[PDB]
Design a protein around this ligand. Structure first.
Ligand code: MQO
Length: 116
Protein backbone atom coordinates (compact mmCIF):
# COMPACT_ATOMS: atom_id res chain seq x y z
CA UNK A 1 0.00 0.00 0.00
CA UNK A 2 2.91 2.34 -0.75
CA UNK A 3 4.73 3.44 -3.88
CA UNK A 4 8.53 3.59 -3.42
CA UNK A 5 9.97 7.10 -3.43
CA UNK A 6 13.49 8.41 -3.68
CA UNK A 7 13.92 8.90 0.07
CA UNK A 8 15.31 12.35 -0.22
CA UNK A 9 15.38 13.46 3.41
CA UNK A 10 17.65 10.65 4.64
CA UNK A 11 19.61 11.10 1.44
CA UNK A 12 19.43 14.82 2.11
CA UNK A 13 20.80 14.15 5.57
CA UNK A 14 23.43 11.84 4.13
CA UNK A 15 24.30 14.73 1.73
CA UNK A 16 23.76 17.79 3.95
CA UNK A 17 25.16 16.60 7.27
CA UNK A 18 26.91 13.26 6.65
CA UNK A 19 28.59 14.01 3.32
CA UNK A 20 29.73 17.46 4.43
CA UNK A 21 30.51 16.29 7.96
CA UNK A 22 32.71 13.58 6.54
CA UNK A 23 33.95 15.81 3.72
CA UNK A 24 35.39 18.26 6.24
CA UNK A 25 36.99 15.63 8.38
CA UNK A 26 40.67 15.35 9.27
CA UNK A 27 40.44 11.98 7.61
CA UNK A 28 38.22 12.85 4.64
CA UNK A 29 41.15 13.89 2.36
CA UNK A 30 41.43 10.49 0.48
CA UNK A 31 37.70 10.23 0.34
CA UNK A 32 36.73 13.80 -0.61
CA UNK A 33 38.64 13.17 -3.79
CA UNK A 34 39.16 9.76 -5.42
CA UNK A 35 42.50 8.14 -4.91
CA UNK A 36 44.77 8.35 -7.86
CA UNK A 37 46.13 4.85 -7.50
CA UNK A 38 49.22 6.09 -9.35
CA UNK A 39 49.62 8.94 -6.91
CA UNK A 40 49.58 7.08 -3.61
CA UNK A 41 51.46 4.36 -5.51
CA UNK A 42 48.77 1.72 -5.47
CA UNK A 43 49.69 -0.84 -8.13
CA UNK A 44 46.88 -3.16 -7.09
CA UNK A 45 44.32 -0.62 -5.90
CA UNK A 46 41.99 -0.89 -8.86
CA UNK A 47 42.97 -4.56 -8.77
CA UNK A 48 42.16 -5.37 -5.15
CA UNK A 49 39.54 -2.76 -4.47
CA UNK A 50 36.03 -3.88 -5.23
CA UNK A 51 34.96 -0.43 -6.27
CA UNK A 52 37.19 2.49 -5.24
CA UNK A 53 34.74 4.94 -3.75
CA UNK A 54 35.11 8.50 -2.56
CA UNK A 55 32.99 11.13 -0.74
CA UNK A 56 33.14 12.86 -4.10
CA UNK A 57 31.56 10.04 -6.08
CA UNK A 58 29.16 9.77 -3.17
CA UNK A 59 28.33 13.50 -3.05
CA UNK A 60 27.67 13.01 -6.78
CA UNK A 61 25.19 10.17 -6.42
CA UNK A 62 23.46 12.05 -3.58
CA UNK A 63 23.09 15.46 -5.20
CA UNK A 64 22.32 13.78 -8.56
CA UNK A 65 19.47 11.78 -6.91
CA UNK A 66 21.14 8.60 -8.19
CA UNK A 67 20.58 7.14 -4.75
CA UNK A 68 17.03 5.92 -4.38
CA UNK A 69 17.42 5.68 -0.62
CA UNK A 70 19.98 6.76 1.99
CA UNK A 71 21.12 3.18 2.58
CA UNK A 72 22.75 3.13 -0.89
CA UNK A 73 24.55 6.33 -0.01
CA UNK A 74 25.44 4.69 3.27
CA UNK A 75 26.62 1.53 1.59
CA UNK A 76 28.74 3.76 -0.64
CA UNK A 77 30.08 5.33 2.49
CA UNK A 78 30.61 1.87 3.87
CA UNK A 79 32.10 0.93 0.49
CA UNK A 80 34.41 3.94 0.76
CA UNK A 81 35.71 2.86 4.16
CA UNK A 82 35.65 -0.82 3.15
CA UNK A 83 37.84 -0.29 0.06
CA UNK A 84 40.20 1.36 2.50
CA UNK A 85 39.88 -1.83 4.57
CA UNK A 86 40.07 -3.98 1.44
CA UNK A 87 43.36 -2.55 0.30
CA UNK A 88 44.87 -1.32 3.54
CA UNK A 89 44.89 -4.01 6.20
CA UNK A 90 42.72 -3.01 9.19
CA UNK A 91 44.97 -0.86 11.29
CA UNK A 92 46.41 1.18 8.44
CA UNK A 93 46.21 4.92 8.92
CA UNK A 94 43.75 5.25 6.00
CA UNK A 95 41.57 2.47 7.44
CA UNK A 96 41.97 4.10 10.83
CA UNK A 97 40.94 7.29 9.09
CA UNK A 98 38.01 5.54 7.46
CA UNK A 99 37.28 3.98 10.83
CA UNK A 100 37.09 7.46 12.40
CA UNK A 101 34.95 8.54 9.45
CA UNK A 102 32.77 5.49 9.97
CA UNK A 103 31.97 6.40 13.55
CA UNK A 104 31.41 9.91 12.18
CA UNK A 105 29.34 8.92 9.15
CA UNK A 106 27.55 6.28 11.19
CA UNK A 107 27.22 8.97 13.87
CA UNK A 108 24.99 10.82 11.49
CA UNK A 109 23.07 7.72 10.36
CA UNK A 110 22.67 6.86 13.98
CA UNK A 111 20.63 10.04 13.80
CA UNK A 112 19.40 9.49 10.23
CA UNK A 113 15.87 10.87 9.77
CA UNK A 114 12.83 8.96 8.61
CA UNK A 115 10.58 10.36 5.88
CA UNK A 116 7.36 12.00 7.04
C1 MQO B 1 43.58 6.98 -0.26
O1 MQO B 1 43.69 6.30 0.93
C2 MQO B 1 44.80 5.50 0.87
C3 MQO B 1 44.73 4.29 0.20
C4 MQO B 1 45.88 3.49 0.12
C5 MQO B 1 45.85 2.16 -0.61
C6 MQO B 1 47.07 3.92 0.69
C7 MQO B 1 47.12 5.13 1.36
C8 MQO B 1 48.31 5.54 1.91
O2 MQO B 1 49.33 4.83 1.82
C9 MQO B 1 48.36 6.74 2.57
C10 MQO B 1 47.22 7.53 2.66
N1 MQO B 1 46.00 7.14 2.11
C11 MQO B 1 45.99 5.93 1.46
Amino acid sequence: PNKPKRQTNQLQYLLRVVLKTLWKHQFAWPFQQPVDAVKLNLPDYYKIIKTPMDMGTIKKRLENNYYWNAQECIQDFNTMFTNCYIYNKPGDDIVLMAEALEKLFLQKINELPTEE
